[PDB]
Amino acid sequence: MNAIGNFLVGTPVFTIFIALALGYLLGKLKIGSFTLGATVGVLIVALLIGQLGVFPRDTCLGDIFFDFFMFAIGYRVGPSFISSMKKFGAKIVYATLIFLVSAFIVAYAAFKMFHIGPGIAAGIIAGGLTQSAVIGSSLETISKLPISDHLKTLYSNQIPIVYTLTYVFGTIGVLIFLRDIMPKLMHIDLKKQAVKTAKELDMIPVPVIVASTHFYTINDGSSLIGQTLGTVNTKFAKGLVAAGLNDSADMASVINAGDVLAISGGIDEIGRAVQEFNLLEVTGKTKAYVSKQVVLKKNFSADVLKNAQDKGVLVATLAGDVMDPAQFSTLKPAESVTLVGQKDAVSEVQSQLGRLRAAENIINYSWFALGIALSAALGIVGTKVSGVPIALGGGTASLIVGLVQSIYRDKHAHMDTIPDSLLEFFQSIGLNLFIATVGLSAAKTFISAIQSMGISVLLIGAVISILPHIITFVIAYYLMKMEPISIIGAQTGADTLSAALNDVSERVGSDASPFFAAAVAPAYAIGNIFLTLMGPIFIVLLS
Amino acid sequence: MNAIGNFLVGTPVFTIFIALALGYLLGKLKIGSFTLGATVGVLIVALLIGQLGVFPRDTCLGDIFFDFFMFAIGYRVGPSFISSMKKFGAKIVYATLIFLVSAFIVAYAAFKMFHIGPGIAAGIIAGGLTQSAVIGSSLETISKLPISDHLKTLYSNQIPIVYTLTYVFGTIGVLIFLRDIMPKLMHIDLKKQAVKTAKELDMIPVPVIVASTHFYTINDGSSLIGQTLGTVNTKFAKGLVAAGLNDSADMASVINAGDVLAISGGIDEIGRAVQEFNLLEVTGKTKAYVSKQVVLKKNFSADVLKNAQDKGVLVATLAGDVMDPAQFSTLKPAESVTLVGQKDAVSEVQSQLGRLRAAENIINYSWFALGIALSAALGIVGTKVSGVPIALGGGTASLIVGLVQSIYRDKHAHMDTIPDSLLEFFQSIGLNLFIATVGLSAAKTFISAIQSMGISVLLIGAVISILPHIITFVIAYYLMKMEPISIIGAQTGADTLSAALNDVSERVGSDASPFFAAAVAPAYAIGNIFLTLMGPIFIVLLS
C-alpha cells in the first residue's frame, strides 16, 4: 500500500478534496431520524484516509479556509446582531460565564481525584474543550516552569498526543449531545423553536403580494376612451397607478383607441379594475417601464414621496408590496423604498429621494478582499497577561471584521455586497476543509494513543467535554428560564466548537441561522479567551 | 520602512488580499474609452507592493486558486463545447499550429540576428510566450547539455531573471494588443461580434412569455357556472388549461358560485379568456399548484405528453413558454419539459414521463470536490519525449476534467450542479490571486533586471511576444477568412495567456463567454504542450 500512501502524501490537494467528496456522501447517510452530517462524515472519512500513511499538518489552506468560514458567518449575521443583542445579550453573557466556571470546577475535581499529570491535564482540556491554542500556551508555560529538563520534555511530548486522542470525541460527542439529545431533552424541535423565536423578532416576514405593471390594451368602446391619463389615474383607487399611455408618462394625453394603458400596483386591485372596465391584457414589448430600489437620503422630502403617485410612480416597500400613504410620514432616512413605473418618472423621483440601491447579485471583490486582509491584520494583534500570551485569533478577528463590515454596508447600502449564496458556500466548505485537514493530520497518533493511555484519558476527556454542558443546561433551562435556541447558541460559543455551528445552522435553516449565529458570537469570544487562558493556570496548579 | 516590509512578508494573506483589494479599485479606473481591468490593475498594484520588501513565491494558495479558475472555465464551457467544435474546430486547430510555428521562426531569426545566448533565449521565450514550465524544462536541458560547469551555472542563473524581466510586458502588452487594438484593427466591436456569433448558433434565446397559473374567482351570473371543469377545459383553446376548481384537480366537479378556477398558460391567451368571460382575478393563497421540471426518460411516451392537457397539466419547454402539440412527437429523450398545474396531476404525469430536474441554486459539494481531486490527479500524469519532460499540467488537466464533468452532468441532469454565480466568482478571483502571487514574487528581480540587460532583452521579449500574433492575425483574417472572435480565442489559447481569458470574457459578457472559452480551449492544450517543448530545442540549437 506504499504506492497509495506515497501518492496521497505527495499530492495534498487530491487527499483533502477526496476526503471532502466521500465525506459528504457519508454525511448524507440517514439512519432512522438521525443524519451524520457533513462535518461528522468528513471527520470520519478523513481519519480512515489518514490511517493509510503519514500526513503533515497543513496550515496554509486549512487556516485560510477557516478564516473564510468565520468571515462568512460574521458577514451573514451582521445586520441582525444589534437587534438580537438588545433582546438577549446579557443572558448569553451570563451563560458563557457559567459554562466556563463549571468546566473549570469539573476539570479540577477530576484531575485531583485521578492524580492527573500536568501535560495530560492540559491535553485533555485542549481536546475536550476544542481549543487548539491551549497546547501552545501550555508548552510556553511548561517551558517557563522550574521543573527538571526530562520532566519538561516528557510533558511537552505528552501534550500533543493526549490532545489528538481526546479531540476525536470532543467534536463528535459534544456535537451530537447539543444537536440531537439536547432538543429532545428540552421537549422542543430545533427547527420549530428556532423559527418561532425568529418570528418573535422581525426576521421572517410573510410573502407579500408584489406590485407590478400590467400592459393592458384599450379596446374600442371602452369608457376610458376620451379621458386623460391624469383623470384616469385620479379616478383609480390606492394601489393602482396609471404609468402612462404607450411609452410616454405625460399626464395630459387622451386615451385613444389602440393605446396601451400600463397599470401598476397589486394583483387583486388590478383585477378589480380589469373587471370594472373590461380591459384586455397584452404582453407589451417595452423596456421603458421598470422598478428601481431607492435608498432614501438623510433629508428625504415627504411631499415628493406623497406626490410620486400623482407624477405616475408607485411607491412600495423593499419587499414589493404597496404601502399606505399614511406610512409616508413614518418613513425615515436609510430606508429603501421601491419606485415602479415609467423610466422618465422613476428617474426623477429617485433623483429627489436618494440613490439607487445595489443589487445582491453583483459581487464586491474589493469589499471581500479588504475584509479578509483586515481579518488577518486584526488576528495578528495580541497581548500577554501574567506571562501567558493571548490573542484575538483568526476566529474572533474574522468574526469582528465581518460584523463591522456588514453593519457598515447595511448602514450605507449604495455599495455592492457579497452574495448570500457565496457566503453560504464559503461557510460550508471552509469549516469542512479545516476539519478534513486536522483529521488527516491526526489519525496515526490517534490510533497509537488508543494503545497507550487508551481508555482512561479518553473517558476523562469525554467527561470533561460532556458534564459542563449538562450542568450549564440544567442551570439555564430550569433556573435561568432561557429559550432553547439561546441556550444552544451560548453553549456552542462558550465551548468554542465551530464544527457545531455549520450543523446546527443547517438543521435550523436559513430562516433563523442568523439568530443562531448571533447567539453564538458573543459567547465565542469570551469562550476563546478564557479557554486559551485555561491551560497555563491548570499546569501551574497541578505541577 | 523595515516595519512595513517585515509585517507584509510575515503575513502572506494580508499582502495577497490587500493587493487584490487596491488592484480592483485601480482596475475600475477608466481613461477615455479604455479600462485597465482587474488583471492588469492587480499586476500593477502587486509590483509596487512587492517593491517594499522581499516576498517568497507561494505555490500553495496561488496554484490551488489557478486550478479553481481553470475548473470554473471548463465547467462553464462544458455543454456548448461539442456544438462549438463541430462548427469551428479545425479552423482553430489550424490557427494554433500557425501561431506556434510563426513564433518559432521569429524567435529563431531574432536570436540568430542578435547572437542571443541560450539561457537568455529560453528566458525570453518563457516570458514573452507566458509559459512558466519552460524555465524548468530549460534547466533540465542545460543540466544535461555537455557544457562547462561555470557556463551551465551562468545560464541557470540567467534564465529566471530574464523570465521575470520579460514576463511583465508579456502579460500587459499582449493582452492590450489582443483586447483593444485587435478589435479596432478588425473593424468590429468585441461585444457586438461575440453576440452576433453566439446568435448564429443556438446560445442566446429571446426572452419567452412564461406560462403561469392565475387564480381567478368565479362571480355569480357567469356563463361558466353550471358547467363541468372538464367541459370548460375542453372549451378553452391551446395554451389555456383549467388546473382545477378550489384545490382539487378532478375533472367532474361543476363550477358553482364562489369557487376559484385556476387557469394556467400564457399571459395574452389568459387575458383574452378573461375579457371573454369577465373573470375577476384574486391572489389565491394556495400551495397546491406548482411548476416542476421533468427530464424525459429514455422511452418517454407521446400519449401521456399529449393527454397531460386533458389530465389538467400544462406542458411547456424548459424556458417556460407553452409548446405546440405537434412538437410533442418531435421531443426526444434527455430533454427537460416543464409541467405546470395541480400537485396531484403534476406528480403523476411526471411519474410517467421521467424524473425531476435538480435546481441550479443547490450546490453539489461532492461533485465539485471530486472534480478538483481528479484535476490534481490528472495533472500529475506526464511523460518524457526525447529526454524532455512534459505533462498535462494544472491548466490542461483541470480544463479536461471540467469539460467531461459538465458534459456528464448535462447528459444526466437529475443530479445537482455548481451554481453559475459561484463558477463566475471562482473564475474571477482564482486567476487574480495567482497574478497577485506571481507579481509579488517577482518585483525586486524585475527592477534589478531593469538595470542589467534592461533595454535589449525587454525589447526583444516584446518583439517575440507581439510579432507572432500580428502575422497569425494577418494570415487568419486576410487569407483564412475566419471570424474575429474565433481568431482572438485561438490566439489566446495558442499563446497560453490565461490572464487574457478573464478580461476578454468580461468584455464579451456572459452571453458569448462560453463561445470564447470554447474557442480558447483546444488552442490552449496544443499551445501549452508546444510551448513547454519550445525551450529545450532552442537551448540545444543555440548552444
In whole angstroms, give the CA distance from residue A98 to residue A468: 9
**Nearest-CA distance A259 → chain B (Å):** 16
Q: Residue A36: phi, psi to the nearest 5?
A: -60, -45
Strands B289-296 and B354-356 come out as: antiparallel
Query: What distance in Å separates residue B374's CA from the closest CA in chain A?
Result: 7
Q: How was this one solved?
A: cryo-EM
Alpha-helical (H) ranges within B145-203 are 149-176, 182-185, 190-200
Report the 10 Å Cβ neighbour count for A540.
16
How many other C-beta atoms lie within 10 A of the C-beta of residue A424?
A: 18
Give the number of other Cβ atoms within 10 Å of residue B510's Cβ: 12
Write down the residue that cell numbers 487584490 correspond to.
B20
Question: Helix H segments across A114-148?
Answer: 118-128, 133-144
> The C-alpha cell of A518 is what?
448571533
As a whole number of Å, the end-to-end CA separation of chain B is 44
Determine whether the interchain pair B376/A11 forms a contact, defined as Cβ–Cβ distance below 8 Å: yes
Q: What are phi and psi of B189, to 5 degrees?
A: -95, 135
Query: Which residues lie closer than 8 Å to A158 by C-beta, 6 or more apart?
Result: A117, A119, A120, A123
8 Å CB contact of A373 and B428: no
Residue that the C-alpha cell 471570424 belongs to: B483
Q: Which residues contact A111 (CB under 8 A, 6 or more apart)?
A: A121, A538, A542
Shortest CA distance to A58 belongs to which of A437, A475, A458? A437
Longest alpha-carbon distance in chain B: 106
Do B209 and A271 count as a contact with CB atoms less than 8 A apart?
A: no
Give which of B48, B123, B220 is closest to B457, Cα–Cα.
B123
Residue given cell 502571487 in the structure block? B437
What is the distance between the alpha carbons of residues A329 and A315, in angstroms, rounded to a whole number? 13
CB contacts of A377 in chain B (<8 Å) are 11, 14
Whether the CB of B21 is below 8 Å from some CB of chain A: the reply is yes
Q: Contact, B477 vs B142, CB < 8 A? A: no
Residue A430 and residue A64: Cα distance in Å, rounded?
8
The whole-angstrom distance between A283's CA and the closest CA on chain B is: 6
- Bridge partners, residue A30, by sequence: A35
In chain B, ranges of CATH 3.30.70.1450 domains: 212-316
How many residue pairs bridge chain A and chain B with CB atoms within 8 Å of each other? 138
CA A151 to chain CA centroid, nearest Å: 45
Positive or negative torsion for Cα A224, A225, A226, A228: positive
- Alpha carbons A378 and B524: distance in angstroms, whole number: 42
Amino acid identity at A102? S
Q: Which three cell numbers stand for residue B487?
A: 481568431
- DSSP conformational letter for A322: B
**Nearest-angstrom CA–CA distance, B484 and B189:** 9
Name the H helices within B11-80.
Answer: 12-18, 22-27, 38-50, 62-76
From chain B, the residues in CB contact with A22 under 8 A are: 366
Q: Which residue has the cell 502524501?
A: A9
Task: Provide the 3-class DSSP secondary structure of residue B253.
Answer: coil
CA–CA distance, B116 with B542 (Å, rounded to integer): 8
Q: Do B64 and A61 touch (CB under 8 A)?
A: yes
C-beta separation of A398 from A74 below 8 A? yes
The distance from CA B388 to its chain's CA centroid, rounded to whole angstroms, is 32
Contacts of A13 in chain B (CB under 8 A): 64, 67, 372-373, 376
Indicate the helix (H) or strand (E) that contains A372: helix A365-380
Q: Which residues of B touch A321 (CB under 8 A)?
A: none
Interface subset of A 460-489, CB within 8 angstroms of B = none
Cβ neighbours of A260 (radius 10 Å): 18
What are the φ/ψ torsions at residue A187 (nearest 5 degrees)?
Answer: 60, 35
Alpha-carbon gap, residue A76 to A517, rounded angstroms = 8
Between CA B295 and CA A32 the distance in angstroms is 30
Three-state DSSP at A265 gives strand
At A180, which amino acid appears? Answer: D
DSSP letters, B447-513, are HHHHHTT-SHHHHHHHHHHHHHHHHHHHIIIIIS---HHHHHHHHHHHHT-HHHHHHHHHHH-TTTH
Question: How many other CB atoms are there within 10 angstroms of residue B248's CB atom?
Answer: 12
Q: Tell me how many degrees the CA angle A121-A122-A127 measures, rounded to the nearest 5.
A: 100
Mutate to test the interface with A, among B425, B427, B437, B506 (most CBs of A within 10 A): B425
Across B421-452, b (16+ Cβ under 10 Å) vs e yields bbbbbbbbbbbbbbbbbbbbbbbbbbeebeee
In whole angstroms, what is the distance from residue B226 CA to residue B254 CA?
6
CB-count burial class (<10 Å; 0-12, 13-18, 19+) for B5: middle
What is the distance between the alpha carbons of residues A407 and A77, in angstroms, rounded to a whole number?
9
Asked if the C-beta of A208 comes within 8 angstroms of chain B's C-beta atoms, the answer is: no
Q: Which of B24, B278, B283 sits opposite A268 (nearest CB)?
A: B283
| DSSP 8-state secondary structure symbol assigned to residue B218 | P
- Per the CB < 8 Å rule, is A369 touching B25? no
* Host H or E run for residue A421: helix A420-441
Grid coordinates of A509: 435553516
**Cell for B177?**
494588443
Residue-wise over A119-132: b if at least 16 C-beta within 10 A, else e? bbbbbbbbbbbbbe
Q: Do B20 and A365 touch (CB under 8 A)?
A: yes
The secondary structure of residue B326, as a DSSP letter, is G
C-alpha cell at B181: 487594438
Q: Quick check: helix, strand or coil at residue A21?
A: coil
Residue type, B232: V
Strand order of the sheet with strand B280-281? B240-245, B260-265, B212-217, B280-281
Grid coordinates representing B254 are 361543476
Q: Closest Cα partner for B261 from B278, B273, B275, B244?
A: B244
- Cα angle A496, A501, A503 (rounded to 5 degrees) comes to 135
Helix (H) or strand (E) run with residue A290 in it: strand A289-296
DSSP A179: I
Is there a contact between A17 and B67 if contact means CB atoms under 8 Å apart?
A: no
The answer to whether A319 touches A335, Cβ cutoff 8 Å, is: no
CA B280 to chain A, closest CA, distance in angstroms equals 6
Pick the CATH number of A212-316 from 3.20.20.140, 3.30.70.890, 3.40.50.800, 3.30.70.1450: 3.30.70.1450
User: Residues of A with CB below 8 A from B380's CB?
Assistant: 7, 11, 14
Cβ burial of A417 (10 Å; 0-12, 13-18, 19+) is: buried
CA B317 to chain A, closest CA, distance in angstroms equals: 19
In chain B, % helix, strand, coil (3-state, to 5) comes to 60, 10, 25
Chain B contacts in chain A segment 360-379 (CB below 8 A) = 361, 363, 365-366, 369-370, 372-373, 376-377
Backbone angles phi, psi at B336, to 5 degrees: -100, 110
The contacts of residue B453 (CB under 8 Å, 6+ apart) are: B120, B161, B162, B165
User: Do the chains contact at A366 and B268, CB–CB below 8 Å?
Assistant: no
DSSP state of A509: -
Q: What are phi and psi of A22, to 5 degrees?
A: -70, -30
Interhelix angle A365-380/A62-76, nearest 10 degrees? 110
Distance CA A499, CA A432 (A): 8
Cβ neighbors of A507 (< 8 A, separation 6 or more) are A179, A190, A191
C-alpha cell at B21: 483589494
CA B219 – CA B221 distance, rounded (Å): 6
A55 close to A515: Cβ distance less than 8 angstroms: no
Which residues touch A191 (CB under 8 Å, ≥6 apart)?
A: A507, A508, A509
Q: Which positions in chain A touch B321 (Cβ < 8 Å)?
A: none
CA distance B172 to B37: 10
Set of cell numbers at residue A18: 477526496
Q: What share of chain A is helix, strand, coil (3-state, %, to 5)?
A: 60, 10, 25
**Which of residues 420 through 439 in chain A touch B, CB cutoff 8 A?**
421-422, 424-425, 428-429, 432
* Beta strand segments in B393-464, E: none
Alpha-carbon span A345 to B52, nearest angstrom: 53
Cβ atoms of A21 and B374 closer than 8 Å: no
Enumerate residues 260 to 289 of chain B having a beta carbon within 8 A of any beta carbon in chain A.
266-268, 270-272, 274-275, 278-283
Q: How many residues does chain A have?
A: 543
The DSSP symbol for A326 reads G
When computed from its CA atoms, the radius of gyration of chain B, rounded to whole angstroms, is 30
The long-range contacts involving B133-139, CB below 8 angstroms and separated by at least 24 positions, are B133/B393, B133/B532, B134/B163, B134/B531, B134/B532, B134/B534, B134/B535, B135/B159, B135/B160, B135/B163, B135/B535, B137/B388, B137/B389, B137/B390, B137/B532, B137/B533, B137/B535, B137/B536, B138/B535, B138/B536, B138/B539
